[PDB]
């Protein structure tokens, strides 16, 4: 495996941190959260949604058509 101290080389980077007993677990959860999920969906819809609507229409057609196919009308 691979171990801390022996991972990679990093220079000039200050991380500031805070103790969880000093800060909120849920901070601006709906204030900031809802704006993000919208933004993330907006971000991804045109890649994710179209194949599933493509499936949707092929499912509701294939259903409609299959059972209409097991019918006659004249003769």
């Amino acid at each position: 495996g691979r171990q801390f101290g022996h991972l990679t080389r990093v220079r000039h980077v200050i991380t500031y941190s805070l103790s969880p007993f000093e800060q909120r677990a849920f901070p601006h959860y709906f204030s900031k959260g809802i704006p993000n999920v919208l933004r993330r969906t907006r971000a991804c819809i045109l890649r994710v949604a179209p194949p599933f609507v493509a499936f949707y229409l092929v499912y509701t057609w294939g259903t409609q058509e299959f059972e209409k196919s097991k019918r006659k009308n004249p003769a």
Partner: peptide
């Protein structure tokens, strides 16, 4: 506070 400051310089 109690808090952390890590200034990393290999």
């Amino acid at each position: 506070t109690g808090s952390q400051i890590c200034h990393r310089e290999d």
